Design a protein around this motif. Structure first.
Motif, PDB file in Angstrom:
ATOM      1  N   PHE A   1      17.745   0.881   1.264  1.00  0.00           N
ATOM      2  CA  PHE A   1      17.229   1.129   2.606  1.00  0.00           C
ATOM      3  C   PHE A   1      17.939   2.294   3.293  1.00  0.00           C
ATOM      4  O   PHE A   1      17.233   3.218   3.749  1.00  0.00           O
ATOM      5  CB  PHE A   1      17.320  -0.140   3.471  1.00  0.00           C
TER       6      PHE A   1
ATOM      7  N   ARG B   1       0.818  -1.206   0.000  1.00  0.00           N
ATOM      8  CA  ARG B   1       0.000   0.000   0.000  1.00  0.00           C
ATOM      9  C   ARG B   1       0.856   1.261   0.000  1.00  0.00           C
ATOM     10  O   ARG B   1       1.704   1.452   0.870  1.00  0.00           O
ATOM     11  CB  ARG B   1      -0.939   0.007   1.210  1.00  0.00           C
ATOM     12  N   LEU B   2       0.620   2.120  -0.987  1.00  0.00           N
ATOM     13  CA  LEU B   2       1.359   3.368  -1.125  1.00  0.00           C
ATOM     14  C   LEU B   2       0.992   4.359  -0.026  1.00  0.00           C
ATOM     15  O   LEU B   2      -0.112   4.316   0.519  1.00  0.00           O
ATOM     16  CB  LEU B   2       1.067   3.999  -2.489  1.00  0.00           C
ATOM     17  N   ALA B   3       1.925   5.249   0.296  1.00  0.00           N
ATOM     18  CA  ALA B   3       1.695   6.263   1.317  1.00  0.00           C
ATOM     19  C   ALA B   3       0.878   7.387   0.690  1.00  0.00           C
ATOM     20  O   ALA B   3       0.511   8.355   1.356  1.00  0.00           O
ATOM     21  CB  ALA B   3       3.024   6.802   1.827  1.00  0.00           C
TER      22      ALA B   3
END
Lengths: 88, 50, 97, 136
Positions: free
Chosen positions: C97, C47-49
């Motif tokens: 990351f 799910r995208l922000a």
RNA sequence: UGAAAUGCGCAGAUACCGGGAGGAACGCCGAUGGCGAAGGCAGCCACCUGGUCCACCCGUGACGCUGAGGCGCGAAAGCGUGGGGAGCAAACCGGAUUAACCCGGGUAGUCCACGCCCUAAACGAUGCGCGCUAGGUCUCUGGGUCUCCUGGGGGCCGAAGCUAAC
């Protein structure tokens, strides 16, 4: 992006003897290499004043490295300035 | 690597470990700040959280 | 030779055929810029922000190549041109990351 | 850079804080100096020490009896220690122009033509030198 | 705004919901913080590039330090050309108060890039600035070690200096 391996060549190139990695000739040699690299940078980033300052720093330092070898031994001084293409 | 061992504070992929905003956490969090921000660009609820 | 890391997100409504096509085009385009695919991973559908193109979700891809430093921004642009590509992210050093 | 002044300075700050000794850069011209101030009483003496191969001249700060009444800080010996003839402002004098130390109570290190002597040792031998510094 | 005027009046506004176009500025973390020559810069990421710190401690060897001309350069600001959009906004307009700067609308303008220009800055740790020397405890930053040391910032001192900032 360079400056990491080519040093060995530049040093061993102006090294007066096996093991010399800081002689007046070496210092100027490696220092000049930096000036050339920096010069090729400002020409692309003219809006970069900070680094431009460091340029005069090495150039001013380099010239001082020259005048020294000049009054102490103008023999190697004439050779280094020629091997560096400095004012032929 | 040097991240309290448990897990890299840079891990912005597996956001299964909730932690937004905050202010205490522990030691340096400058490297973590960029982490959260990097995740928010992908899929990290930038709403508010409490 | 600088090692990098790219995070692409395709359309969450693409079949296995269309999905396979995009990858074949991304891996390809990379090689055209001196990028060697060292590893690939297919995260999945999270799910995208933020809802991109009126889409709250999307398919994420994982890449890791060591392409020329002065040609990275050229790839990201060569990848975001795709209608399927919802967005692209590039960082540095192995896994992102 | 002045090695002497910097040295005489350490001697001062050494007594203010009340220390037993203070290390200084080993030097010939300095050794003689410390030697004289030791023959008078300004200092308990000095000694050569090589720290990690580096020679120094740690000196022993001398102090007088106890103060007149309930009060620590022993009575100092070197009430002052400055230099006259120093870099830039070269100050030389003759045997008939020799300065005047603090009413005899002290010595004016003069680099005369006969080794580092004092105000009297120079007047006697009739020789002038450089006003190294006045101690009192 | 405590009032009110103004504005909204093709429509159906404003606070609602979704989408579309453009521009500018870019939160929480930003902190007595940090970097840099000053200015200034803080969403994030990649590349080019400068300065600085620390460690082992090989090499060349004080080739040093400060520094007047000169050269480059500061917030806001005005000025010329090309040029798009948004926020705010002094001259301007209006209500009110009065008998004024608060509130509303708001164009020129402020903006970005090049060039010209480049003051009081900041700060008061700046007459610059260098080396050595004295020196404990507490909180915070960086490296190698781990009752430590080198290099910063803040708070309370001791010696000494300055009475006249105590």
């Amino acid at each position: 992006p360079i400056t990491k391996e080519e040093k060995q060549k530049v040093i061993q190139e102006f090294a007066r003897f096996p093991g010399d990695t800081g002689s007046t000739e070496v210092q100027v040699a490696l220092l000049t290499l930096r000036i050339n690299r920096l010069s090729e940078h400002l020409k692309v980033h003219k809006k970069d004043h900070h680094s431009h300052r460091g340029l005069l720093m090495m150039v001013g330092q380099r010239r001082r490295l020259l005048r020294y070898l000049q009054r102490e031994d103008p023999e190697r001084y004439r050779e280094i300035v020629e091997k560096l293409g400095l004012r032929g | 690597r040097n991240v309290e061992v448990l897990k890299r504070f840079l891990s912005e992929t597996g956001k299964i470990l909730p932690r937004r905003r905050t202010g205490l956490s522990g030691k340096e969090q400058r490297i973590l700040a960029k982490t959260i921000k990097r995740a928010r660009i992908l899929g990290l609820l930038p709403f508010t959280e409490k | 030779m600088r090692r990098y890391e790219v995070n692409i997100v395709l359309n969450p409504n693409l079949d296995q055929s269309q999905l396979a096509l995009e990858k074949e085009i991304i891996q390809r385009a990379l090689e055209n810029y001196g990028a060697r695919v060292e590893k690939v991973e297919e995260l999945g559908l999270r799910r995208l922000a933020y809802p991109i193109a009126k889409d709250p979700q999307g398919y994420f891809l994982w890449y890791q190549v060591e392409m020329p430093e002065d040609r990275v921004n050229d790839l990201a642009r060569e990848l975001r041109i795709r209608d399927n590509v919802r967005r692209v992210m590039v960082v540095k050093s192995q896994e992102p990351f | 850079t002045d090695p002497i002044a910097d040295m005489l300075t350490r001697i001062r700050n050494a007594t203010r804080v009340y220390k037993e000794s203070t290390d200084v850069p080993a030097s010939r011209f300095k050794e003689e100096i410390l030697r004289i101030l030791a023959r008078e009483g300004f200092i308990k003496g000095y000694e050569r020490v090589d720290v990690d191969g580096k020679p120094y001249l740690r000196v022993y700060l001398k102090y007088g009896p106890r103060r007149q009444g309930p009060d620590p800080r022993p009575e100092q010996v070197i009430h002052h220690i400055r230099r006259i003839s120093k870099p830039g402002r070269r100050v030389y004098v003759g045997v008939k122009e020799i300065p005047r130390v603090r009413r005899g109570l002290g010595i004016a290190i003069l680099s005369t033509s006969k080794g580092v002597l004092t105000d009297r040792e120079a007047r006697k031998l009739g020789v002038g030198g450089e006003l190294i510094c006045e101690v009192w």
